[PDB]
Amino acid sequence: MEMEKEFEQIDKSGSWAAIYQDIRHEASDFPSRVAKLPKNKNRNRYRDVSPFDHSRIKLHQEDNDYINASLIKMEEAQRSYILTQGPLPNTVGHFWEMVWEQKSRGVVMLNRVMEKGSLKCAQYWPQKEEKEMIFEDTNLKLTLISEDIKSYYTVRQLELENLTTQETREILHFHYTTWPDFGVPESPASFLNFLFKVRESGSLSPEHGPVVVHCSAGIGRSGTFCLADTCLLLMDKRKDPSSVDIKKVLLEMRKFRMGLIQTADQLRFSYLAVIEGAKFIMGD
Ligand SMILES: O=C(N[C@H]1[C@H](O)[C@@H]2O[C@H]1c1ccccc12)C1CCC1
């Protein structure tokens, strides 16, 4: 079926939970043996969210190459994403090592450091220009260059220096700051505006390594971001945009990381975002 009318048909019939459970039943199951090794317990935030072995990002380190991160490679859309958990106190150096080694231009953050009165990720970037961060375990230096605070999101320019070679690179930090502590946003307008700002920066384009996107577990809000982006790109590429099937795209993405889209409300919100986004692209 088309998307917008399939949407109204699920609303009128109140069957979002059944649609979402079907997706959960059909989703791929692949091994995640490296994630479960005892030496990696303090590298995982949640015991039930792990990268598959076949798609995990490897650190270029011979001691321990493990990080909780996955490469989502979308062949028809010609887009790739790295989805990862919010960094832990003992993985902030690994996180920036990955950004460096994978040649990423942008980092997309969809959570606040504290939500619901608890810590959802480490404070892994510097908050003042004159107070830079040094990660001694991976030999990297990170400096805040500029910060632009808007009503729904903040964009930061960061300098990452490999202290071993003295090479430097500019990284863009895109921080969506207004996702509610509970539920999903009422309108997708600010989330779409944010997606378009990431696109306009070059951070999703083929001349760079994959964008790094995270929330707390790296599957819920993070899944919504890449699902909406890929569906909109396919609608632009194809002769028949009504042939884009959001459930099929989500199942394709779940071949590369488990659990993408965590609730039926997140699934409905993803439909809403793609529907509204397709009108603004055109022509309008
Ligand atoms: O190569 C780098 N740093 C070097 C350190 O001296 C040490 O040897 C290298 C390294 C890489 C990973 C862990 C530990 C080390 C930067 C490239 C991303 C980090």
Q: Which of 91, 96, 97, 171 to mutate to test the pocket of ligand 1 (most atoms within 8 A of CB)?
A: 97
From which experimental method does this structure derive?
A: X-ray
Q: Is 215 a catalytic residue?
A: yes
Q: Is 221 annotated as a binding residue?
A: yes
Fold of 1-284: Protein-Tyrosine Phosphatase; Chain A (3.90.190)
Distance 224 CA to ligand 1 centre (A): 33
The one catalytic residue among 121, 215, 226, 231: 215
Answer yes or no: is 220 a known binding residue: yes
Resolution in A: 1.6
Q: In terms of DSSP bridges, do strands 66-74 and 79-84 run parallel, antiparallel, or are they unpaired?
A: antiparallel
CA of 64 to the centre of ligand 1 (A): 12
Positive or negative: CA dihedral 185, 173, 123, 222: positive
